Amino acid sequence: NLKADPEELFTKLEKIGKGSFGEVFKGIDNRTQKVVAIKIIDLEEAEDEIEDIQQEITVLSQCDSPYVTKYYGSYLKDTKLWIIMEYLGGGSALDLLEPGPLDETQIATILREILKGLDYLHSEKKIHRDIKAANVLLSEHGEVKLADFGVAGQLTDTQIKRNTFVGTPFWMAPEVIKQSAYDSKADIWSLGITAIELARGEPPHSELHPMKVLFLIPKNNPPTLEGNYSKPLKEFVEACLNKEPSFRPTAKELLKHKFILRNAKKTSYLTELIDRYKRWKAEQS
């Protein structure tokens, strides 16, 4: 269902970031005057990644959730592909970490929304496979959505597990690194690492070369959250970071976790985090 002549319907504005496969631009929907995001891919240089580009479009087109970046369509224009998506003016959760530590209400609120996205994807038999703070995007008013579906996996009636080596090493589950038959529980491990990332600012082993962590993650005991954090947050992380995937809770189960129930609050409060970043960035030299 590829479409054509995107500039009849959309206006391309300035670059707002680097994405997977290409650059992302702000844009305007000329029908509504709402702002959109436009990922532009040069298909002439897209030798090999073409399969992942195709997967991103396919997965996006099949999702309809408030917790997954909305998809407006894909348009061909010369050698370039325009992937038109929901605009999220708060940028990534990773960027919002830069000014300093989050508090546990912020951590819980963000994790809750990520969990609602994972619950949706997993119920659709989709596995994100690159869960990390960089792929968690916020609206300017604090709504949270999962993004970047280029390496997402799809389970079917004839394929009940995946085994592809994909993801970002520090966040990868041990069974993904070993390329065992795995499923949505791999996302739950990555969620645990992301919880540490949100709490401490960086995932475990962040100082090391990624090739080193590829042997450390299966070799070592799972990471734990160290430092002055509430018992339920430490236990949330521990529950996610089990070497045995079948012992990890589902996203649905984690939405009932004491840490989430006690600490998550209205998403609109996350606007404070966006304002904190704007202030920080404006002062930055």
Ligand X SMILES: CCS(=O)(=O)Nc1ccc2c(c1)[C@H](/C(=N/c1ccc(CN3CCCCC3)cc1)c1ccccc1)C(=O)N2
24 in a known ligand binding site: yes
- Residue 202 neighbours by CB under 8 Å, 6+ apart: none
State the binding string over 45-74 for ligand X (x if CB under 6 A, else -). ------------------------x-----
Task: Give yes or no for residue 166 binding ligand X (CB under 6 A).
Answer: no
CA angle 65, 166, 216 (to 5 degrees): 120
Task: Give yes or no for residue 184 binding ligand X (CB under 6 A).
Answer: no
State the binding string over 25-44 for ligand X (x if CB under 6 A, else -). ------------x-x-----
User: Using an 8 Å Cβ cutoff, are 216 and 193 in contact?
Assistant: no
Q: How far is the CB of 232 from ligand X (least distance, A)?
A: 29
Task: Give yes or no for residue 106 binding ligand X (CB under 6 A).
Answer: no
Report 219-258 residues binding ligand X (CB under 6 A): none
User: Using an 8 Å Cβ cutoff, are 107 and 60 in contact?
Assistant: no
Q: How far is the CB of 137 from ligand X (least distance, A)?
A: 6
Q: What phi and psi values does residue 74 have, to the nearest 5 degrees? A: -120, 135
- Classify strands 126-127 and 153-154 as parallel, antiparallel or unpaired: antiparallel
Task: Give yes or no for residue 88 binding ligand X (CB under 6 A).
Answer: yes
Burial class (CB in 10 A: 0-12, 13-18, 19+), 227: exposed
Q: How far is the CB of 207 from ligand X (least distance, A)?
A: 24
Closer of 39 and 248 to ligand X (Cβ) = 39
Closer of 69 and 194 to ligand X (Cβ) = 69
22 in a known ligand binding site: yes
Instruction: Tell me the C-alpha distance between 162 and 130, whole Å.
Output: 14
Task: Give yes or no for residue 197 binding ligand X (CB under 6 A).
Answer: no
Quick one: which of 107, 121, 134 has its CA closest to 66?
Answer: 121
130 is catalytic: yes
Task: Give yes or no for residue 87 binding ligand X (CB under 6 A).
Answer: yes
Q: Which residues are catalytic?
A: 130
